Each structure stands twice: as C-alpha cells, then as structure tokens.
Design an enzyme around this catalytic site. Structure first.
Site, mmCIF file in Angstrom:
data_model
loop_
_atom_site.group_PDB
_atom_site.id
_atom_site.type_symbol
_atom_site.label_atom_id
_atom_site.label_comp_id
_atom_site.label_asym_id
_atom_site.label_seq_id
_atom_site.Cartn_x
_atom_site.Cartn_y
_atom_site.Cartn_z
ATOM 1 N N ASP A 342 0.745 -1.282 0.003
ATOM 2 C CA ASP A 342 0.036 0.058 0.018
ATOM 3 C C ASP A 342 0.923 1.216 0.048
ATOM 4 O O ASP A 342 1.868 1.386 0.677
ATOM 5 C CB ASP A 342 -0.987 -0.029 1.081
ATOM 6 C CG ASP A 342 -1.840 1.047 1.246
ATOM 7 O OD1 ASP A 342 -1.811 1.841 0.115
ATOM 8 O OD2 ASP A 342 -2.737 1.362 2.086
ATOM 9 N N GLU A 378 0.880 -0.830 -5.151
ATOM 10 C CA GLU A 378 0.024 0.575 -5.299
ATOM 11 C C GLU A 378 0.923 1.657 -5.589
ATOM 12 O O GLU A 378 1.505 2.288 -4.788
ATOM 13 C CB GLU A 378 -0.897 0.686 -4.377
ATOM 14 C CG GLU A 378 -1.759 1.768 -4.300
ATOM 15 C CD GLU A 378 -2.626 2.208 -2.789
ATOM 16 O OE1 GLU A 378 -2.505 1.382 -1.997
ATOM 17 O OE2 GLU A 378 -3.400 3.036 -2.739
#
Ligand SMILES: Nc1nc2c(ncn2[C@@H]2O[C@@H]3COP(=O)(O)O[C@H]4[C@@H](O)[C@H](n5cnc6c(=O)[nH]c(N)nc65)O[C@@H]4COP(=O)(O)O[C@H]3[C@H]2O)c(=O)[nH]1
Ligand SMILES: Nc1nc2c(ncn2[C@@H]2O[C@@H]3COP(=O)(O)O[C@H]4[C@@H](O)[C@H](n5cnc6c(=O)[nH]c(N)nc65)O[C@@H]4COP(=O)(O)O[C@H]3[C@H]2O)c(=O)[nH]1
Lengths: 693, 693
Positions: A342, A378
C-alpha cells in the site's frame, strides 16, 4: 534469573530450545531493559547490557514460548533533538512474531501529558499496551509446495480475513471471521469454484485501532495501521493471542496451498500506528525515533507522505533491514506467496524524491527470497510527485490506476477517447512497454477496497460516508461512477436490469483485458456498502460479505467468465500486440464493419468498438517452447447510450460466446452462431464476444 | 536444438538435472545470444529471446556441467553515449561458477582497434578469451561445522594460495601452490601449531593476467584484478578448469573447517579486470557497460577511485545484486567464513562522496547470509576523502593502518609516539569507541601483503621494487621502516641480533594489543621479499614462502608461543575498552621511573619508554554463560629508547614471562622473578612482560 550475553542475531526473541534470545535495536539508548510480564502484570525487568553494533541483546535460559515481554528504553526525552525515549513506556518488540492484547486507549500510552506535547509522560504504559510474546516457531508443513502459479494465469481475489467469512452460513461461530475460517473447505472451495489463483489478504500484520476511531464508536477495520511487521493480527485469531495466532495463519496457508491458491498478503511498510508527534509511544518512537521515522526539519514534527500521521525513514538501514527481515519472514517462515504494498511510492522515497534507484528497490531487487515472490504495488502516495504508475522498476507489478479510471469512464458514458481505453485492453502499452515489462505488469482492477464496490459503482454518483463519523468528508468525492437512473436502491426494473448488466460489463472488460485482473471480495454476490466508498472504519455488516436468484446468476456469470480467460490464452498474453508488419495479431474495427483509421481513432464522440484477437498468432512459447494456439475472438464493445448496429468482418461463420445484454449470463449459457457480414444489432451499454474455432 | 524459455532466476548457468538454465542481464542489449562452445572451438548459438525485467534467459535441456559457454550481446557500439557492446566479443558470464582457460592476449579481446579507441573491433574474441563453464553444484560437505570462532579469539593469518604451499618440502609437486595443497595435513598442521583461527586468503576470485604484465615478462600474482566473482581462480587448481576448481576449493574448506580454521576470503569488488577504456572487452563492458561501471562525466571514459583502470557503479542495483549474489554464493555454497574487502571505501561511494548510508552498506548490514560472516575492510581508497579508518558502519571491522604506523614509529624511536602508542594498544579508543564498536573492530597488523614483510621491515629504509619493472616508482615510498644499521643482508652479529629481536617487538606488540591481530604469511620463518615492498607481480622466489631448515625456527617458536600467551590470557583480547578510573583500575600507565604518568608527562615530546599494568581481576565482561572472566594481572614494559633504561616494578613478586631482548627466545623459555620494587636494566628496543595473579 540467569542472563547470558546471547547474540545480536536474529533481532527479536528467538527460542533456542533451552531459552530465548532477545535482541532489540536502539542507537540512541543509554540503557535498554527487557521486561518479562507475568499473568499478573508485574514486570521482571532485565538489563540487556551487551551492546553489539547498536543492538542490545541477551540470552535468558528458561524463558519459553508464551512469555509476555516488552522493552523499556532508558534514553533522552528531547523532542527538540528528535529523541522521544521514555522508560515509563513498555515498548513492543518490532520483530515480535506474536503480539497479545489490544491497546487500552488512555492517557498512559502517549509519552506526553495530554496538554503539553512538549513534556514527558511518566505514566506506565505496561497495563494499557500490547505485549510481544515469545513464539515456538515449530510448524509441520507436510507436502507444502508454494504453488508458483505463472503470472499470466493469475486471478487475484482481494479479500479481507474477517469480512470474507463472518457471515458465511457454513462455518461454526468460532471460525466466523478468523484465519481458520478462511481455510475452511467451504471457503477455499468457493474460491476454487470462482477460479481465483491468488488470495490478496488485506493487512494481516497486527495493527492498532486508531484512538480517534475507538473514541468514536468505531474501530480500525481495514488495518492499514500495522505496528508489528512480523505478527499476525491477534483479532483474526480464534485460537488465542499467546502465539497461537501465528499457528492459525501458518495452517490457513497450508490449507490454501493444498488447493492451489496463492497467498499474497497486503503489507503496509509506509507508516506506523504511532502516527504523528501527537500519537502514542508503542514500539519505535520509544526505541530510536530519528532512525525509524522520517523526521521533519524541526525534529519534533514528522513529515507524512501517507496522510496517516507519519512515515518511515527509507534510507536508514535499521528500517530497510526491518522491512526485508519482515518480507523474508513471511516468505520463509509463513510461506506467503507474494506481497502487495500500500502506497508503495513512499517506500521509494529515499530522501524526498520518488527514487526508483532507492535502497528499497535495490534491496528487494537482489534478495533471492523476496525477489521471487510476486511483487505487486500500489504505485503512488499522497506526496509531491506521488503518482508513479508506470515508473517502478521492471521487476514490479503495479495496480493500474489508469485502468480502473479509464474503464470506469467508458461504461460511464464519458467521451474518454477510445484509444485511451484501447491501450488499457491491450494491457497499458503506453505505461509498461518502454519500461521493459510485459502486459502482466498491469494489475487490472475496476473496484477494490477503496471506493465503491462493483454494485455501488453502478448505484451511486457520490459517496455516503456519513456513517464514518467524518461528515461525508473522507474517501473519494467522485469515483467516475454513474447511478444508472437513481442514486441508491430502486424498485424500477429498468435501471435494475441496467445496473446488474453494467456489473457484467465491468467483469467482462476485466477478464478480457491484458495483464492480471483482480476482484474485490463480494462482487460475485453483488456486494454493497450502501454507498460508503471508504469503509476503513466500518467493522460491521457494511463491509462483511452477504453469501446466501439475482445474486446467483451474476455469480455463475463471474465463474464462467474467469473460465473463458483460463481456457483461452489470448486474453492472457505474455507479450504485447503489434498489429502490423511493414495474419495480423490484432485488428480494430468500427461497428460499421470497416477497419479504423487514425482520424476515427481520435474521433471526439465515439463509444463503439470491434476488436479482432487472432488465436493463430500468439508469438510466444509455452513452458517447453510449445507454440501456444487458441481460437480467434471478436470483442464488440458498445458504450453508446443508444442501440448500435454492429457488422462482423463475409463468407465464414462465427460463434457469439459472450453477451452482457441478457439477464441470465451469456458466459454461463450458449450462443447463436453468426456469420461474416452478418447484421448484428447490439444493445446500449453492452458487450459481445465471438469465437472462430 | 531444444530451447525452453526457462526462468530469470538465478542469474548465470544453473544446472538442474535435465539441463541448464541460463540467465544474463543487459538493459542495453537489443539482442543477446548464448554461444555453446565445443572442444573444436565451434559455436552452437542460441538467442536468449525471453527477456524478463532486462534479464534475458532460456532453459536449454541437455546442457550439462563442463559445457563451456559464453554470451554474445548485439548492441549499439557508442562510447559517446556510454555503450561498448560488441557481438564480435564472446562475453563471459559475470555469474560464472567456473571459468576455464586463460586470456590469450591479442588484438581480439579489446573491443576496439588498437589504433582507434572510438572505432569498433570486429575480431572474434572466442579463441582468445576465457570460457565460463557450467558446474554441477553437488558437494557432500559432510559434517561441515563452520568454526564460528568468536571475535575476541580470532588470529587472522593473511596467506596467498600459491605462496603458502609452492615451496613446501612436504606436498607432492602436483599439489604445491594449489587449493588442495593448502588443505594438506602438513599445512593445516602448521596453521594449528601457529595459533591461527582464520585464514585470510588473498583474492581467489578469478582474475586476469594484466596485458601490461604478461607482455612485460611478469604476471598478476596477488590477483586483485578479477572478472569472475563466482569462480575460484583456475590457476590455483591442480584438478582442472572445466568446473573442477570449484571442487578443490570446496574440499579445501571442509579440510580447514575439520581442523577448526575459518577461510576468510579476500574479495575485490571495487574494480574489474576489464580496466578503463583502452582495455579488454571480456565480461561486463560488452553486456551492459553503463550500469555496471562508474563512467565519467564523459561516458567514454571511466571514473577510477582505485587507481587500477575502472570502478563499479555502486548505485545501479544490478551491480549491488552481483556483489551480494557473489558474497552470498561463497558463504552458502563455498562455506567461506568471512570476507576481507579491498579498497572498501570505493564500495561506499554511492555517487562521489564516501557515504555512510551507501546502498551497499545498507544491503550488507541487513542480509542474514552476509551480515553474520566476519566482515572486515581495508577502510580507504585513492579517491577524494578516501581515508575512512574508523568511519565504516559499526557492523564492520577495519585494518587499522594507524596501528601499523604508530607501532613502527615507536620501535623506530620516532619523537612523540608514546601517547598514540597507548591508544593503539588500548585498541584504538579514538577510532572505534565513539562509533559504538569494540576494540575488536581494529584489525591490528604491522606487516601485510602490502609494504615490507617482517624481515624487510627491519632491514630496508626504502623499497627495492625494480623487479616490478616500473623503475622503483611503485609501492609505498617511505614505509616508516628502519634498517637497523645496514640496508640489506649484513653479516654483522650486532645488526642481525638487532633485526631478529626487532622482529620480536612487532610480534609481541601485535599480539599484546587489543583487537584482532593479523600476521602476513611467512613472518614465522622471517620471510623476505628482498626489499620489494609491492610484490603484486612477483610470481617467483620473491614472494613464495621458504619453509624452515636455527634462527628461522627460534623465531618460529617465539611466534607460536606468543599466540599461546594471547590465547591463555583474556586481558590482551579484552571484549571492551579500558577506563582505568573510578570517580577498579583496569589499566595503569607507569614510567620506567616507577610512578604513574601525568598529563604533562603524557604529551612529553621526548619519551620512548612505558610500563603498563593490565588488571586481570577487573575484566568487566561476562562470558558465554555469564561467567566472570578472570586472569592474572600482567605488567608490560616498553623501551623504544636507543639506550639501556632502568625499569622499576610497582607494588609482593612478579614473574618475567616475556622478554624480547634475549635471543634464546623468551615467549616459551621461562624468566626470572622480579622483586616488585627493584630496578631492572632493560635493553634498548626491548619489551618485557610480567605476570602475577
Ligand atoms: N558495541 C558494544 N560496545 C561496548 C559494550 N560494552 C562496552 N563497550 C565499550 O566498553 C566500554 C567500557 O564499558 P565498561 O567497562 O563497562 O564501563 C562503562 C559501563 O560501566 C557503563 N556503561 C556504558 N553503557 C552502559 C550500559 O548500557 N549499561 C550499563 N549497566 N553500563 C554502561 O559506563 C562505562 C563507560 O561506558 P562507554 O562510554 O560506553 O565505553 C564502553 C564502551 O565503549 C557492548 O556491549 N557493545
Ligand atoms: N528475435 C527477437 N525479436 C525482438 C526482440 N526484441 C524485440 N523484438 C521483435 O520486434 C517486435 C517489437 O519489439 P518490442 O518493442 O520490444 O515490443 C515487445 C515487447 O514490448 C514485448 N515483450 C516481448 N517479449 C518480451 C520478453 O521476452 N520480456 C519482456 N520483459 N517483454 C517482452 O512483446 C512485444 C512484441 O514483441 P513481438 O510480438 O515478438 O514483436 C517484436 C519482436 O519480433 C528480441 O530480443 N529478439
């Protein structure tokens, strides 16, 4: 008590049969003490006198698994210099392999008095903090091979541990919402039925419930707030938290591998639950604050490229070591098959810039254990120069944000040019061709945990996160979504037929694209969050999965569409198309039936497509150099708000194998066989695929 | 032929059972091919088509070990942009596990025509180049116990593979100078008799004979000019070069490890044997020249912080990967116990400056395979700010060149040496205490492969390197050495006794100092290189060791016995630093007068005598199980004066255990008892040690 000097490796508490060796790091600690918690609080503190290369260590014979322990770092409390050391705070072991308890939110866990963040809080953190636990590392993986599923066969199913199983009417109440329930034969079988090959488990690193969330009625649900990069989240553990959660996770992995499903877990190495300078002092702020965190100029204050309080110093070795020592731990000790980072750009920020030559990338690129597992990213963060889609090193795979946006807009009716969506079907040639990657570098997805679920993608124009307690100010304000006629649930069959069929278009576009598709958990059952596009705090029925006719035809639609990609190697290509030399491998056509020129490609207002994918011309080898053959296909896209008439290219036949238009599922059911120059009218906002055997 | 796509990991030719998988990296190669060499010089070319993140690879079933191979990379020859790719050259595999043959120095292996650096040589390098070989990685290391000798027990013995054993009147002619001869029981017996616990092996990474040195009648002897960081040097193998050399080295490790000796390899990762431009295109220049070598701000030319042609780009991860893939390979595949780094400041140069946080240091600090083996560095390079003695991260050890200089100055009678002499005995508290390290971070050494050997160090004031052919211009120009009355071999009993006894002072001071000592090979038999202080090219009688047949064995039993006294007594190998004051006295400095020194008489300009009391009961260090380390109290008496000084003993009785002055050798021969208040006339340039519990 007998204390032997022990060894500085490996960091953390490791159980050498007889006793346990503790090794903690702080290069700005005068004295470090190891606290041995009992079942009645009551530390039995031990000074780790032996300092070797700034790691303080000792070997305590007799200490055994289940021992609750923590650290007390006697150092200078000087925020002016950036040191927030405090011996009244029982710090967690960052390398703790199992953490017990939950944060008892109060005045005691913070390190500063509640009014003066400049002063020292001499309150004991012990009775209100999480406790690191010694772990018996034994686990008998029997036949446990890592199912090294090739990249062009992957179907990633993003799922939450608690949200996947809490509402399954097949597991006992004990297993509903935990790791062991995720390993139940009824859940693994369902993913087997769905055809997914890799489970993306939303963060399982143990995280802290945000104080702002707890003193609001809510709790941290998604868990992108980890504190222990080595311990499974003890709230997803039914077998207990005294080191039994690491047993649940290891067994849930071998149960997934026993069916051939990869475990790609979600890692959050960009920030800690200690947050900004106004956060608690739990693990690292008390160990060595300036060597773990990216301190802002004026050390008291923290810089934050993640929007969640703080960020980690990605240039200090003691952080990079902790990140890789974690990444390797879950590959070799926990047998995890891959990682999804993330806000992965934060990891590349060595100084301030997103450096794709940063020590993080160089580390991950070389280490044999981590460089072989699936590295998914990401590829952005919320700082200056954060959007890095198509810039990571070629060893990486990225969430194709340009895919979700440039496809959400297509079926939204936007005049997003066809060539924008066309390259996204081709697998983002623009983004990943020149970098030296393959189409498999684009992790395609339409929906995820962020934003709307697939049903709320076609049921809401804007968000309804008022339930999040932030007054509809959180999450995306516009999701490139269309409510299809009425924002929210509607009895009108007109939009209902439209929505559930728009759901079909997104699923068909996703499985027909190049690279690696990904599905958010629940989109088979038409999962709905009531318009809440940011459910990080909804640990309730908003984000659980509703399992048990409309929610079963869409399901067998999804199951049979993933079958089409599995059966046909064209929709999963190992290289890029080229379309023309100076039998083509891809041909683009107009619904009129004639080939597309450059003028009608950059046509301003266009919404229809007919793409020819050749099956004889997959210029790729198989595993053993075998030529990969396939049927040719003919995909007919129509985002037009009106019925458009599609012409096929004369004398020979075809077989429509896909059609979004009918509310019974065309991947599931069978098709009429069309011919070459056949007039074929296609409904508005629909899809159709043909097949030449 | 059958060519499967295969894997991209691991790099190099890895045999599996069916055949071999080849993987080479080049981000600047339009096409790469795999040339398979037969015994008639013919090629079987195979395009390694399958690129994967710029690593081109194929699995060739049926290719088995002993298969000589190479790579040909088709790429733009453009030194103006930094590319020097040439398919005319048969490139080695940088991950070569075995390289066979030698470089046949011609006009073929240069990549450019001998009269035009910026033109392109189109001569096939295949018949004149080295050949990488596929290896069968099998070895049955039996009961290999890595003798994890502690750091406060280590005695490093710097020895060359060919020099240690080529002149041994014990080994067969076939084994002399080879790896197996190093493993002969007569050699490992001598290492045992000596007291060494770690064998520093001068570079065994395969190097190239410099064309400057082959065409001048000499050869590259030390071997600090390497091309294969994965293959043992084939010219030290009596069993063959078609992969057979890796078998010798592996058995040469289990033989040493059986007798409990650590093989601490010397590695040279800063530069390559391809040198600058005007040099040969052998391994990496043709593969991806710009991302491996530190090119200048004129990509045509090569930045050189080692003074040996070129330097490596320590920011491009493909180099960092290669350095760790290599460093890891020798640890977990060749069972090597540690690494000594050549010009290790170059490895820290991430862009220009010698960086503390260099990606290399961050990489080595974290990797569990490499952070645990003994990491030792020579902490400088010839670039700007290269002198970094006492600047490496705390996990590292360093050649303490200041120890060498100071102890040479003291026994030379240089003016104000006693002060510094005291911190180099204490274990360089100035250089290492503040860093967070221990005394063991100072690899003390008087002589090494560089400079003079222990005999030439007391026999020559200046170098005699005319053998090297550069007209006595190379090597150190003043080595801080004193000839003791005549330069060269003399007959005088006076000088001969002075020299051989001066040898007794360097060895006594070295073994008596804190930190890890180090002996260059041969100094036990009074090894002599004739005054040559830079023997990098003398592969002849100059640098090979003479095995002894009275003076060359009396000095031997002095050396062997002083390693005994360092072993038998933990005071000289203290695990911590001294402090000598409360506000137990663990160290006390006295004057030959017999009274404790003062700060004015510490920085006294003209002082050459010392008396140090080393407390044995005050070793404030725990043992392996928390045992209190006890020892007899020792009394050292240094007299670097030119005349006989009268020494007084402080405080009962004392026992003379060491005396440099008498030629009978008095590490092993016992001494009289000194009163404890009485004066003792101590000879000039002599050293004495007293013992009392
Ligand atoms: N990497 C590493 N280096 C070590 C270690 N132990 C000692 N060194 C070195 O040993 C020197 C002397 O420590 P001492 O004899 O115990 O005398 C010390 C000691 O009694 C005490 N001291 C320093 N740190 C500590 C600590 O962490 N715990 C305790 N109980 N005493 C300490 O004050 C004295 C002076 O301390 P220093 O300035 O630090 O100087 C230290 C330090 O440079 C170790 O375990 N790991
Ligand atoms: N024999 C040979 N031909 C080469 C090579 N490189 C490029 N070409 C040829 O020229 C066409 C376009 O190359 P491209 O720009 O790399 O565009 C490439 C490239 O973007 C992608 N890609 C293809 N193969 C690989 C691969 O092996 N590894 C990676 N990481 N990406 C690849 O597939 C696309 C299309 O390649 P093709 O369908 O084959 O059509 C290719 C191919 O026929 C090579 O190294 N050897």
């Amino acid at each position: 008590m007998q204390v032997w000097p022990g060894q500085a490796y490996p960091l953390g508490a490791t159980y050498d049969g007889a006793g346990t060796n503790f090794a903690v790091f702080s290069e700005a600690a005068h004295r470090i003490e190891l606290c041995l918690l009992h079942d009645d609080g009551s530390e039995t503190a031990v000074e780790l006198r032996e300092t070797d290369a700034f790691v303080r260590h000792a070997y305590l014979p007799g200490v055994m698994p289940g021992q609750r322990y923590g650290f007390r770092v006697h150092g200078p409390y000087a925020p002016e210099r950036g040191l927030r050391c405090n011996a009244a705070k029982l710090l967690l072991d960052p390398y703790a392999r199992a953490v017990s308890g939950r944060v008892r939110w109060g005045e005691a866990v913070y390190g500063y008095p509640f009014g003066r963040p400049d002063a020292r809080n001499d309150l004991d953190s012990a009775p209100d903090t999480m406790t690191s636990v010694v772990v018996n590392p034994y686990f008998d993986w029997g036949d446990d091979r890592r199912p090294r599923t090739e990249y062009h066969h992957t179907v990633i199913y993003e799922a939450h541990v608690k949200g996947l199983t809490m509402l399954h009417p097949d597991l006992p109440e004990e297993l509903r919402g935990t790791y062991a329930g995720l390993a139940h034969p009824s859940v693994i079988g369902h993913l087997r039925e769905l055809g997914v090959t890799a489970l993306e488990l939303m963060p399982v690193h143990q995280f802290v419930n945000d104080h702002r969330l707890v003193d609001a009625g809510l709790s941290n649900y998604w868990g992108y707030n980890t504190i222990g990069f080595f311990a499974p989240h003890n709230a997803y553990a039914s077998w207990g938290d005294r080191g039994q959660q690491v047993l649940e996770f290891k067994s849930a992995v071998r149960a997934l591998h026993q069916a051939g499903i990869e475990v790609i877990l979600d890692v959050v190495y960009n920030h800690t639950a200690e947050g900004n300078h106004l956060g608690p002092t739990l693990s690292m702020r008390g160990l060595d604050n300036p060597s773990y965190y990216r301190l802002a100029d004026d050390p008291r204050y923290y810089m934050d490229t993640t929007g969640t309080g703080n960020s980690l110093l990605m240039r200090s070795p003691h952080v990079l070591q902790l990140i890789m020592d974690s990444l390797r731990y879950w590959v070799t000790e926990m047998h995890v098959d891959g990682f999804r980072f993330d806000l992965a750009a934060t990891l590349a920020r060595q100084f301030h810039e997103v450096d794709r030559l940063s020590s993080f990338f160089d580390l991950v690129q070389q280490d044999p254990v981590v460089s072989q597992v699936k590295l998914i990213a990401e590829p952005w963060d919320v700082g200056e120069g954060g959007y890095q889609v198509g810039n990571f090193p070629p060893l990486w795979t990225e969430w194709n944000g340009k895919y979700r946006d440039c496809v959400r807009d297509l079926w939204r009716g936007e005049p997003r040019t066809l060539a924008e969506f066309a390259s996204r079907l081709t697998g983002s040639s623009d983004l990943y061709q020149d970098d030296g990657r393959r189409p498999l570098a684009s992790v395609n997805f339409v929906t995820c945990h962020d934003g709307f679920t697939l049903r709320d993608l076609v049921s809401y124009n804007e968000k309804r996160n008022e339930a999040n307690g932030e007054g509809n100010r959180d999450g995306e304000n516009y999701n490139r979504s269309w409510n299809c006629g009425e924002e929210g649930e509607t009895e009108d069959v007109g939009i209902t037929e439209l929505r559930a069929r728009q759901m079909r278009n997104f699923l068909a576009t996703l499985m027909l694209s190049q690279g690696v598709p990904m599905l958010s958990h629940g989109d088979e059952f038409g999962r709905t969050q009531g318009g809440n596009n940011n459910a990080y705090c909804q640990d309730n029925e908003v984000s659980w999965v509703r399992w048990p006719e409309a929610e079963a035809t869409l399901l067998r639609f999804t199951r049979s569409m993933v079958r089409l990609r599995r059966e046909h190697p064209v929709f999963r290509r190992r290289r890029f198309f080229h379309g023309r030399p100076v039998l083509t491998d891809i041909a683009w056509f107009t619904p009129e039936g004639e080939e597309m020129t450059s003028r009608d490609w950059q046509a301003a207002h266009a919404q229809a497509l007919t793409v020819f994918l050749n099956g004889n011309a997959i210029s790729e080898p198989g595993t053993q150099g075998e030529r990969i053959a396939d049927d040719s296909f003919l995909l007919m896209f129509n985002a037009s708000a009106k019925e458009l008439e599609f012409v096929v290219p004369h004398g020979r036949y075809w077989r429509m194998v896909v059609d979004t238009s009918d509310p019974e599922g065309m991947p599931p059911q069978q098709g009429p066989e069309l011919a070459g120059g056949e007039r074929v009218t296609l409904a508005p906002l629909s899809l159709t695929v043909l097949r030449r055997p």
